[PDB]
Design a protein around this nucleic acid. Sequence first.
DNA 1: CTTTATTCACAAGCTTGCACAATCCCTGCTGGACAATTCTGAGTGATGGCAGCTCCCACCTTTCCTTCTTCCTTCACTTAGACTACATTTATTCAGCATCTGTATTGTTGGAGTAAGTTCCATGTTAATACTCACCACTGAGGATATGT
DNA 2: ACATATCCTCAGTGGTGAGTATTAACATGGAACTTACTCCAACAATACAGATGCTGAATAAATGTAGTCTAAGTGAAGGAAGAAGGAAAGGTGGGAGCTGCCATCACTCAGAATTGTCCAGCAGGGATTGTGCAAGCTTGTGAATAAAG
Lengths: 107, 107, 96, 97, 96, 96, 75, 75, 226, 226, 83, 84
Amino acid sequence: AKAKSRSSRAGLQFPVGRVHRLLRKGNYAERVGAGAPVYMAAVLEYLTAEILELAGNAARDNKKTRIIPRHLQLAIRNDEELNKLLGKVTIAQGGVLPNIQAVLLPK
Amino acid sequence: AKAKSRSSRAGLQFPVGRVHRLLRKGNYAERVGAGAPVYMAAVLEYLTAEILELAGNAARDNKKTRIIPRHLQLAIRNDEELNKLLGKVTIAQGGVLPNIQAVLLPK
Amino acid sequence: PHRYRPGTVALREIRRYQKSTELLIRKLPFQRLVREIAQDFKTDLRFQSSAVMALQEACEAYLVGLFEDTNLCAIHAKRVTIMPKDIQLARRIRGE
Amino acid sequence: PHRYRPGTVALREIRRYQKSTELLIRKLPFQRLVREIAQDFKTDLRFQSSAVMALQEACEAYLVGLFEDTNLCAIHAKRVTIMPKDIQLARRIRGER
Amino acid sequence: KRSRKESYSIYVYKVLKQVHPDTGISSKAMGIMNSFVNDIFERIAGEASRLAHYNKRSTITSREIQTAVRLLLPGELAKHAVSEGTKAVTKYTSSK
Amino acid sequence: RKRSRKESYSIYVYKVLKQVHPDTGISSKAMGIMNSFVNDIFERIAGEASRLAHYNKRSTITSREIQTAVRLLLPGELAKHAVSEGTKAVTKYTSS
Amino acid sequence: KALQKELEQFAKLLKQKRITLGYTQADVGLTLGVLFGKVFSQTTICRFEALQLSFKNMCKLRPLLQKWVEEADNN
Amino acid sequence: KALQKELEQFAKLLKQKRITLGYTQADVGLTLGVLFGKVFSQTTICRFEALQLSFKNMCKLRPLLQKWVEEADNN
Amino acid sequence: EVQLQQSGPELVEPGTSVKMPCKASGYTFTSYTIQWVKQTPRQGLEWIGYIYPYNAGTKYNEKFKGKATLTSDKSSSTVYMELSSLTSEDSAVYYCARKSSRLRSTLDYWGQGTSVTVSDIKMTQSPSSMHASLGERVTITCKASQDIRSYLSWYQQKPWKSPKTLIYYATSLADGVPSRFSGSGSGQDFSLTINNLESDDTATYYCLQHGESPYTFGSGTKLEIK
Amino acid sequence: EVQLQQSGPELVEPGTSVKMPCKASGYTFTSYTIQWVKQTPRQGLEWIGYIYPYNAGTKYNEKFKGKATLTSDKSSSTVYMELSSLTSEDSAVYYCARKSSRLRSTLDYWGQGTSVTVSDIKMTQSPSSMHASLGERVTITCKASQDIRSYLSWYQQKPWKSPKTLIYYATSLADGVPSRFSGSGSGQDFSLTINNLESDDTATYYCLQHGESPYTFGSGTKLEIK
Amino acid sequence: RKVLRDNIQGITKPAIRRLARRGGVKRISGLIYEETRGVLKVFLENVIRDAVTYTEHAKRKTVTAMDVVYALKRQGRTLYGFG
Amino acid sequence: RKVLRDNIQGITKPAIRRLARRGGVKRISGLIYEETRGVLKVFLENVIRDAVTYTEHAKRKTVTAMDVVYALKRQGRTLYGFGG
DNA sequence: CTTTATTCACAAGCTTGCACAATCCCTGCTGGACAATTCTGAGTGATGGCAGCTCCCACCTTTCCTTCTTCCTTCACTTAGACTACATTTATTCAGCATCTGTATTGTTGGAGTAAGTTCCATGTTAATACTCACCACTGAGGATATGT
DNA sequence: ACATATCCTCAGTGGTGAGTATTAACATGGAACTTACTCCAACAATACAGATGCTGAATAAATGTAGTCTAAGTGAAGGAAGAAGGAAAGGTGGGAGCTGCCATCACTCAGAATTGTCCAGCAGGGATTGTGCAAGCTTGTGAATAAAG
C-alpha cells in the first residue's frame, strides 16, 4: 500500500484527482471513466503551458522578469488560434494590441 | 385512486411528468424539487401559446387557415421580445421580413 | 419595344424574393458542393437527404443575413452598389 | 509661438493610450453611476469593490471594442472623424440593435 | 420493431386548439414548434442548473426556474411567464 | 472558530511556469487570469463532452468523449497538439 | 348591341367634356377619388375613353363618370 | 477506351460544323426529325455534344448525326 | 418611472390639422406600442389606434381611418398624432397610453391627455351609476357582445384625470393596485369587485376589451362614496 | 493537400534586388507563419527568417537583417522574399516552408525552392556520413550547444529536392512518415534512429532547433545505402 | 466514387443575385460573386467539419440532419425544423 | 440612505476621448459623447440587472464580483481575473 | 424643356378539382401515477468578524470654458464605364422508377470497468515571514515636429 | 534641395517598499483496497435508404448587346474640431469609526428519491378529409413611351 498520486503516474503537473472530482460533482454525466480526467488534465496543462510560455516570451522581450496581464493579453491577441479560442474573453488589465489604421497615419 | 395526471392538477396542457423525467435525466442537478417541472411546463406552455396565437393571427391576415413556418417567422420577427429571444435562431422555410431601405426606392 | 429602366426589375425581384420562402440555390449543385467539401475530412461518407436540406437552409439564411449587413454597409458609404469591401467590413464587425 | 498640427497630437495620444493598461474612466464617478443605475432595481444595495472594478473593466473593454468598430465604419465611409451614425451602424451589424 | 420517438406535437396541438379553435398547423410548423420548445427547455434547465450550482445546492426548485426565466426571457415576456408559472404552481399545490 | 479554505489552480500553474520559464515569476493578477482561463476551458470541454455523451445515449464520459470535445472546441493545430498530449498522457497512465 | 352604342356615345361625351373643361385623365381620376373615396388610375379613365375595358367594367364605371359630368358643369 | 476517343472527336467535329453553318441544337434536332422521321429534343443534342449519355445510346445515335453532317455540307 | 408627457390644450379652428406629441421616458421605447384613445362626454372613450415603434407598424380604428395618422420618432422617443380636417365634433380629450406587444398586457400607463376644442364588439356595463357608502361590496358587470378569451381590463378614472389601470387579463391586478380590487369572469361575462370603499373610490370605472381588432370600451359606471 | 508554389531559377547580376513568391494553398493562410531558409554547398541550410500573415509580424535572422525583407499579400495568399544588393555569395537555393504558430510545431511543408545565381546555438551532428546495408539500424546524433526543451526537428532531403519533415518535438512522427524512423532525447542530447534501410533512404538528414530566437540547422549527415 | 473536383461554380451568378435580392440588395458589383463563393465555402467547411466530427464520434458513416443541427448550434447558429 | 441622480455626466468628455484613443480613433465628432453615454448606460443597465438578479437569488444584499462575472458570461462577454 | 395621354408588362383578386398532406382513429406498450418507505438537503437560528459604508482633509491633477486656427467634411458638377434589362441559345436540374448493397438498427451476453464505502496519510491552503523586481527622481540621447531658408 | 529650436519618447543610474516567494501547521481530500453492479463492446441477422443510372420535361444559366445612371474624381466653402492657456473642482489616497450582513455550525424535518404495480396516455400505422395550390380569366395599376402645350 503506498504513493504515486494519479498526476505523477500520468507524468502530469495538473491534478488528475481534483479534475476527476470536479467531473464527478459537476453534473456532466452519470459515470466518468478513468481516462477522462487524465486526458483532460493533460489538455489543460498543455494549454496552460502554451499560454504561459508565450507570455513569458512577451515579458522577456520587454526587459521584464514577471508576467503581468498585459503579457497574457499580448500572447493571446497575437495568435490566430488563441485569439479564436479566447475571442469572446476580456482580460482584466490587459489593454489592447497596438494597432493604428494605415489611412490614419500622416503623409 | 384513478391516477389523475399532474398536468391536470396544474391546469396545464404540457406534460408535467415528461418535463420532470427530462429534468431528471438531463444531467442538470442531483435532485428536482417537484414544483420545478410544473413551473417549467407552465412557462413552456405560455411561450407556445403566445407564439401560436401570433402565428394564427398572421395566418388570418394572410387569409390562411393552416399555420406554416412563414407565419411563425412573421410572428417572431415582428415582435421585439420574441425576436430578442430567438435572435440567433434560423427558422427553416421562414423567409425574411419584407424590408427595403428607403434610399433604394425611386425618385 | 419596351424596356424597363435599371433598378425597377431589381426592386420587383427584391419584393418577390422577400415575399417568398423557398430555397434559391438549386439542390443538385449544393449537394455536389457539400459532398466534395465533406470528402476532404472523411473519404467515403454518406449523407442523409435531410442533412443536405438543413445545410442548404443554414447556408442560405447565413448568406441572406450577410447580404443585409453588406447592404447596410454600402448605404453607409453613400452607395447603392454592394462591393467586396462592404462584405469584408460586415464580416469584420460581425467577428468572422 | 509653437503649435502642434491637428492629428499629430492625436496620433501620439493613440500611441500612448494603446500602450497603457490602466482604467480610462475615473473611479468615483463610475461608482456613483453604477450605484444610481442599480438603485432602480433594488434599494439599499451594496457592492464589493471588486464588483465595481469588474464592472468598470467590462464597460471599458466594451467601449474600446465599440470604438474600434466605429473607427472601421468611419474609415469605410472615407472619413477620419467618427460620428453617431458610425456607432449606430456598428451596433446594428453587431446585433445589439 | 422500430423505436418510438416522442415529441411535443400533441401538446402544441392542444394549445393551438385552445388559442385558435379553427386554425390548423402543418408538419413543418410542428417541427419548428418542437425545436422551439426543446431549445427553450434546454436554455431554462441549463440556467437553473448553473444557478443551483452557484449557490452550492443540489436541488433544482421552482425558485431556480423562476430566476432562470427572469434572466433568460425579455421583460414583459418574463413577467407573464413568471405569472403563469406561479399560478400553475399555486394551483398544483392547492390541489389534492 | 470558523474556517476559510478556497481552492484554485495557482499551485500547478506555478509548476508549469517553472517548467517552461524557470527564471520568471508571475503577478497575482496574472495568476487570477490563468485560474479563470483554466476554469473556463474546463467548463467548455466538460460541457461539450457531456453533450456528446447525451447525444449518443451514453451515461459515461470517457477519454473518447474528451478527445472529440477537444477536437470540436480547439482550433486546428491547437486541437492537434492537445489531442497528442492527452493521448500520450493516457497511454503513460495506463501502463503503470 | 344596345349597350355598346350607348357606352360609345357616353365615352364620346366624356372625352368632349374633358377636352372642353381642359382637365386631364389623371385629374378625372383623383376627382373621382375625392368625391367618392375610391381613387382610380388614369389608365382606367383612358381605357374607358378608348372602350378597351370589358362591358361589365364599362357598365360599372359609367354612373361614376356620369356623376362627375353633372358635378363638373357647376363646380 | 477506343470508342470514347472516336466519339469525342466526332462530337468536337459535330459542334464545330454546327457552329460554322450557324445551326442551333434545336434546329439540328428538327432537321434530324425531318430527314429520318425521329425527332430529338435539344437536350439530346446538347447531351450528345457533351458526351453525357451512355455509350450504347451514343453508338445508337451516331449514324443519324453522321448522315446529317455529310448531308448538310452540300445542302 | 414610466410617464407619457403630452402637450397643452388646443383651441383650433375647423378644417385644419393638429400634431399631438406623446413623449415617453423611463422604459425601452421600441418594445412597447403606443395606443391613442379619444374621450368625449357624449360617447365616452373610443380606441383610436396604435403604433409600434419597433417596426413603425400602425393600426387604426375603422371609423378613425384617414382622420388620424400616427407617426414615431425613435431619436426623441416621441409619438405624434395627426388629426386632419378638424370638425366641431372632435372637441375631446386625446389620451396616449403604453401597451406591451404581449397579447395579455393592457394599456398600463397613460398620458395627461390633450383637450382639443374646435371653434365590432359591444361592451355593456349593467350599472350606469351606483350609490355606495363607506363599507359595502361593489360589483360591476361588463357583458360582451362576442367571446373574448379573458382579454378584458378594468380602468378607474378620476374627474379631469387620466384613467388608471386596475385589472388586466380579467383577473390580474395592475402594478401597484391594492388587493382590495378583484376581477372575475371569462368569455362574455366579466365582473369587477371593490371590497371596502375609501373616499378616493369615487370615480368612473370602464372596462376595455382588446381581444379583437377594434378595441372597445364599456359605457362606464359612476361611483361615489357617502 | 498543402502546397507552397514558388518560381523558377533566377539569374541576377550583382548589386540589384530580387523578389520571389511563396504562393500557398490548401490551408488557412493567416493561421500559419511562412519561414524562409537558404541552402548553400558551403555551409548548408541556414534560417533566414519568418513572417506571420495574421498580423504581418516578421522576425529576421541577425546576419540577414537588411539583406532580406519579407512581405505578405493576404488577398492572393502569397509571401514575398526580397533580397537586396545580391553579392557573389548569395547564389543559393531559397526555400520557403510553413510553420504553425505553436511552439511545438515545426516546418512541416516546404516549397520547391528558387535557385538564385549572382553573375546563437551551434547544433552538432557527430557522424558526418556513413554507409549501411538494407536491413540494419542507423543512429545520428545532434548534440546541441545550449539547452532546448525538446524543440528539435529531423528532416530528410533527397538531392535536388526540398527537405521532408520526419520528426518534430524530438519524438513525434510527422504526417505520413512511417514508424521506421524514431527520434529520442531531450535537453542537449538528441538522436534519430532508422529501423531498417531501404533503397530510398539515401539522402541528407538535418536536425533543426527552434527553441531560441535564431533557428539553427545541423551540419547534415549523408546516408548512402549498400 | 468520383473525385468531385471544383463544384463551387455550381453556385451560379443568378443564385447569388437571388440571395442578394432576398437580402434587399438593389445593385450588385461584378466582383461580389467570387467573394460570396469564398464566404460560402468557408462557412460550409466550418459547419461540415463539425458535422463530420459528430458523425465520426457516433461511429456512423452517414451524416444525419441531427449532426448538422448540433454543428450549427455549436456555432451559435441554431436551426429550427430538422429535429 | 441617499438618492443619486444625473451621474451619467460623470463619464466626462475627456474620458470618452481616452476610450476612443485606445480604440485608435483620430477625430471625434461633437455628438459622439451623448451617443457613447447612452450606449454605456444601456450596457451597464443590462449587466447590472443580471447581476442584481443573481444577487437576489442568493438572498444577499451585497453584489459580489462573482455575480458580475456570471452576468457578463450570461451576456457572452466573459471576463478573466475576478474569480470563477 | 414640362406636363400628359396611350401602351405595356405585371401582380393581384376570383373561381373550380384535386391530391398531398393534415386530421383522426385503433392498437399495443411503455412510461407516468399511487403508495409506503427511506434518505438525505436545506430551511431556521445563533455567532463572529470582516468589509462595506460614512466622514474629514489636503493636494494637485484633471476637467471646464474661451479663442483662434486649420483642415476635414459636404456639396455641386462631370463623365467613363460598369452595371441592368432582355432576347436567344445552351445546359443543367428536377421528378419518377428501378437496382443494390452497405450501413443503421435491433437482440442477447457477459466481462471489463466504474461506483461505493473505510482508512489514512500526503498534499494543498493559510499564516508568518525575507527578500526582490519594478516604479518615481533625475540626467541624457536620438529622432518626431512645425517653422524658416 | 536644406537648418533649427521644441516639446515628446526610449535609456539607463538608486532607493526602496508592495508584492512575490519560502517555511511551518494542519485538515482534508485523494489514494489503496475490496465488493457490487451495470453498461456498453461484440457479434449476428436484417431491412431500408442512400448512391447510381435513365430519361424526358421543365427550368434556368450563359452570351451578347444597348444604354442608363452611378461611382468616383475635382474643386471650393465653411464650419466643426482641436490646441493652448488659465481658472476651478473634485478625484484620490489616507485615516479613523461603526455596524450590517456574509459566511459558518449545527439540527431536524419536510420534501425528494426508491421500488414495485398497473393502467391509460401516447406513438406508430392506416383510413379519411379538406385546404390551398395549380390553372385560366379579369382587372386595376405602376412604369415608361409618345404627344401636346
